[PDB]
Amino acid sequence: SMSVKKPKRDDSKDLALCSMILTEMETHEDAWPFLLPVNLKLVPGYKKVIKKPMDFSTIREKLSSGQYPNLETFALDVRLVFDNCETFNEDDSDIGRAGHNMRKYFEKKWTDTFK
Incomplete structure (x- = not known):
């Protein structure tokens, strides 16, 4: 609240690290x-x-x-990509499977990098 703050989590590397994750997603087959x-x-x-x-x-x-x-x-926004894919594409299609695989891939990188 006013003048009462939780300790400052270091966010100074967040931009760089999101950019690395995004590169990894861009280059996935x-x-x-x-x-x-x-x-x-x-x-x-x-x-x-x-x-x-x-x-x-x-x-x-x-x-x-x-x-x-x-x-x-x-x-x-990354999860939006996969949520949109699941909305429009059957699970048993090449695109539907791609979207599940990519979501799994992302969520691991996300947990390992930030949690």
């Missing part, structure tokens, strides 16, 4: 469905169904331009 924004002109249903589209290139640009106020808003 199963990243291909997620590298660029889904083409809203060419994929029926996507625009109407997926209210907040998100992809790794968009996260990379946000990260590079100071549009993440903290590491939790970064994690929210």
Whole structure:
């Protein structure tokens, strides 16, 4: 509360470490469905169904331009990518499996780096 603060957690490396995680996600062999924004002109249903589209290139640009106020808003956009994938894609499809694999991959890097 006013003039009463928990000890300061060192966040000075957070930007660098989120950038490293994001590099690892970008270079994973199963990243291909997620590298660029889904083409809203060419994929029926996507625009109407997926209210907040998100992809790794968009996260990379946000990260590079100071549009993440903290590491939790970064994690929210990464999880949005996988939540959108599960919304639109069957679990037993190449894309559906890719999205589960990538979410698993991310969540391990996230825990190991920050928790």
